[PDB]
C-alpha cells in the first residue's frame, strides 16, 4: 500500500507540473524581475535627461566642445544616476 | 564595404557596425529599422535602394587567467564571448 501511494503521488506530481504550469512562479518571477530591470536600464539610454539630443554622436557632430560639454554633462549625469539605481536594485535583489 | 566594423555615415546618421546587406521588408518610404529595444538597425543608403543590417563590432571584456606569480610568470588570456577568429 505504501509503495502504491508513493508511486501514485509521483504520478500526480507529473500531471500537475505538466498541466498547471503556474507552479513555477517563484523562478519565473526572478527571471521576469531581472528582465524588467534590464529593460528599464536600456530604455533609460534613450532619454534626454534635459539635454538637446539623446544621441551622444548627434550631440558631438553638431556642437562645439564648449556647448557639447554642457550637453554631454547632462547626459552623463542622467545615465550614471540610472546605472547606479539599477546596480542598487541588483544588490538588493541578489541579497534576497 | 561590408562584413567589417565600419564607421558608417548616412545623412549624418553615424556609428559603427558590421554593415551587412539585409532583408528588412520596408515600405519604400521607411528609412531604417529597430527591435525590442529601439535600436538603429538599418539605413536607406542615399544612393541605392539598399537596406543593410547592423551588428556592432564585437567587443567583450578581457580576463587574464594566471597561476600565482609565486609559481610562474606564465598567463593565459580569455577574450570573453568572441568567435575568436576575430581577435
Amino acid at each position: 500500500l505504501i509503495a502504491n501511494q508513493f508511486n501514485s503521488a509521483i504520478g500526480k506530481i507529473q500531471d500537475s507540473l505538466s498541466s498547471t504550469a503556474s507552479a513555477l512562479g517563484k523562478l519565473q518571477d526572478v527571471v521576469n524581475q531581472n528582465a524588467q530591470a534590464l529593460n528599464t536600464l536600456v530604455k533609460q539610454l534613450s532619454s534626454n535627461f534635459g539635454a538637446i539630443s539623446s544621441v551622444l554622436n548627434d550631440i558631438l557632430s553638431r556642437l562645439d566642445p564648449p556647448e557639447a560639454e554642457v550637453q554631454i554633462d547632462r547626459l552623463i549625469t542622467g545615465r550614471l544616476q540610472s546605472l547606479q539605481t539599477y546596480v542598487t536594485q541588483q544588490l538588493i535583489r541578489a541579497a534576497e | 564595404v561590408k562584413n567589417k566594423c565600419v564607421n558608417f555615415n548616412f545623412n549624418g546618421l553615424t556609428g559603427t557596425g558590421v554593415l551587412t546587406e539585409s532583408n528588412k521588408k520596408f515600405l519604400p518610404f521607411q528609412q531604417f529599422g529597430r527591435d525590442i529595444a529601439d535600436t538603429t538597425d538599418a539605413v536607406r543608403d542615399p544612393q541605392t535602394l539598399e537596406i543593410l543590417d547592423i551588428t556592432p563590432c564585437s567587443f567583450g571584456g578581457v580576463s587574464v587567467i594566471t597561476p600565482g606569480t609565486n609559481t610562474s610568470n606564465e598567463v593565459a588570456v580569455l577574450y570573453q564571448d568572441v568567435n575568436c577568429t576575430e581577435v
Partner: peptide, 22 residues
C-alpha cells in the same frame, strides 16, 4: 515550463545545466 549591445554582457554560469543535473 520556464520561459543588448551596450556593454550588457551576460557571463555564463560556472556549473552547466548538465553538471547540475549530475
Amino acid at each position: 515550463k520556464v520561459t543588448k549591445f551596450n556593454g550588457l554582457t551576460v557571463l555564463p554560469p560556472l556549473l552547466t545545466d548538465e553538471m547540475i543535473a549530475q
